[PDB]
């Protein structure tokens, strides 16, 4: 009908369930609620064996699975979105699609907030001036008002500088790489001149 536009487009049959779940939850403005219920369901399948038996065992009938998922999800602040979603995934035997629908829901939510998770690998631990002059250098690697979520790391094999890891792209602004590409260029010149 009239659903909100998804923040970023995705692949098929496990991410389309997440895009539909996101558009329904943004139509109800329960975006942080059903993400929390999805995390609670990940932990639920982590905790008990009888619950993941309804997702892995092929000999449980559909009637048992849909009636257990209906009867155990009657109340307790679970939204109509999550309860109808688990009815819809239990009706089809597709309860195994939860672990792959939550990561696409997470990517959808991490795109509606205009954020970006990153990893800064520095040779030494950072100060409160060695960090503040880094993020203004790191914010030119996003193309909009994306606020990076700083993640610091340590690696002594860098000789100072920083490496950014955006999980999509990697900027090697280190010195140990700079003295590597210095020697390659100076050796590729002396073999010419």
């Amino acid at each position: 009908l009239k659903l909100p536009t998804a923040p970023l487009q995705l692949s098929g049959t496990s991410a389309q369930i997440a895009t539909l779940l996101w558009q329904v939850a943004a139509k109800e403005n329960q975006l942080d609620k059903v993400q929390d219920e999805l995390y609670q369901f990940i932990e639920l399948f982590k905790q008990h064996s009888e619950l993941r038996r309804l997702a892995t065992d092929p000999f449980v009938p559909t009637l048992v699975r849909t009636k257990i998922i209906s009867s155990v999800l009657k109340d307790s602040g679970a939204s109509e979105i999550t309860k109808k979603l688990f009815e819809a995934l239990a009706d089809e035997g597709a309860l195994s699609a939860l672990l792959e629908v939550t990561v696409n829901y997470e990517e959808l939510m991490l795109a509606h907030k205009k954020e970006v998770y990153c990893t800064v690998i520095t040779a030494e631990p950072l100060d409160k001036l060695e960090r503040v002059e880094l993020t203004k250098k790191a914010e030119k690697f996003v193309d909009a008002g994306f606020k990076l979520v700083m993640q610091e790391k340590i690696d002594k094999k860098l000789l100072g500088g920083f490496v950014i890891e955006f999980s999509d792209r990697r900027v090697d602004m280190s010195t140990a790489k700079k003295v590597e590409e210095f020697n390659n260029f100076v050796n590729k010149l002396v073999l010419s001149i």
Binding site: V24, K46, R52, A55, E92, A94, S96
Partner: peptide, 29 residues
Amino acid sequence: KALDELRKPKFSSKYLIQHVSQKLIPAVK
């Protein structure tokens, strides 16, 4: 780690999106 059983989704149908949209669009109030 028992979550490794749920790593790959086992889809018994291809048009599952139509069934879950028949059940998630009526979840809107």
